[PDB]
Symmetry: C3
Subunit: 194 residues, 3 copies
Amino acid sequence: DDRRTLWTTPDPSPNCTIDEERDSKLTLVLTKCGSQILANVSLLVVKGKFSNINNNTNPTDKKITVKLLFNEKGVLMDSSSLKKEYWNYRNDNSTVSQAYDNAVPFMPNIKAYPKPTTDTSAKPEDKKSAAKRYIVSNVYIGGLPDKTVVITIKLNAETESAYSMTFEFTWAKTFENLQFDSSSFTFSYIAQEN
Amino acid sequence: HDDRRTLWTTPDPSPNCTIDEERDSKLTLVLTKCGSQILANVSLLVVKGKFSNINNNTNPTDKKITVKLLFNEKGVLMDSSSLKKEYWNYRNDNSTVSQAYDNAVPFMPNIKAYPKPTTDTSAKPEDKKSAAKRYIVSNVYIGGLPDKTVVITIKLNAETESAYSMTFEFTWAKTFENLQFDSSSFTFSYIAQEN
Amino acid sequence: HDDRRTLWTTPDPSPNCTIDEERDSKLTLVLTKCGSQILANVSLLVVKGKFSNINNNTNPTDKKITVKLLFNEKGVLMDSSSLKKEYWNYRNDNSTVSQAYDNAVPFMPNIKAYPKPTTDTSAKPEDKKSAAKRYIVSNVYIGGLPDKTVVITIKLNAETESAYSMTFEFTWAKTFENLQFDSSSFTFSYIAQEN
């Protein structure tokens, strides 16, 4: 039993809805290293549209969005892309018996990543960072170096939640009969506390 | 409340960093000690002066930002650093410990992994020291926009004037037009010194 | 003292890695356990042989380096690994513990996350296992120079002859001209096994 790891499991059952119910397996591991969460994420789409990307037949199919929305206790809300049953603290290679009550120490820090406001100040010195809540990099479908995908992670940008972590996968290339299967990506973010 | 495993700006700093003019930028830098590695997270918002409004039509040579942290043998930030000292400290809640730290050696880049560059080329060519190992190079994105590519170059212990150093170099090849420098967050690690 | 939360080369290794000829490279690899994840940091300097002076005018096919770590069921490095065993160990200061380790299972890539590839023509298409999840693919830069791009491909538990494995593949498309292979440092993580 391990409250320093919040994860899917390492080998989840279909646990993620992109197009149809549970069409994907999100493997997401959050490990608390004090003031930072060390995050690791991979996504396999097992059925439906993104199990077979074809941008000759479907030229608009170039984006996948996975949304994790959390309430003020850091509990996953039902409106999340990820399903709740095996999103929990680590026990061995599974989850603790019952649903967690609190994961605030795993939430994106609300000072670093405040909930977006519509501030009326033009003055570039009054600007709140737009970019700081983003992690943007590349992952590779099948770990093939030519199959470039942009991964965009955004923290606490979702309006209808206390905290949020969204994963956006986009590609410019024309993929042809290609199962969405992302090489693993590691990032970190500043942690909230109790 | 008080946390010697985190050395940070705060997570929401006041202007704390000089690129062009005094305190024209906000560097958000968190160093978290995970034993023999420091887990580093860095973002930079330029609030005033040249890089608060990059324009490479008017200023085609404005394609580089260098932020230097220089540390003495105790790991104290030297006044010549780009980063200002007032809120560079160990974590207390979402702020810093009351008084200035006197020692942060355990957050310094390991001096065996990243020795201070020497003026020796007389070495046995196989005893030649890595030039690259002290570098982290990747991309960040202004506004997190995927077209606004910036190269981030981090260099450890390369500054001659200091016992330890951590330098952030942001460069771009594209012609940016009235664009506030605002980098997506970057995570890296480095091998830690010890006391 | 002694630190079983760090499994490393040393931070400043002697030639410890065979790419072409015996001990022609220095691999600096640090694995630090942060619970259910290993925080990994890797850099590679080739000190002698072909890749100490890459020339793709003279040798246009010399565009790949592979470093293989193979582990048995106890997480002990097997002799068929690219890396040499003498200074692959738990941390003591900037060196290794006196005696070779018996067990490093808690540093191995998680076998549920990264199962050994099977040749299963039993294939309910929805039960198809990830090909990509065991990969980390990114760029490093020789000399930390932004133009000297190298692809780094890390694969976990893909080697057939071992209980666990971690392979580093460096590739480039550009024509390098009298360039010592010297990679900027790369940080990643992976999900840890436990005992």
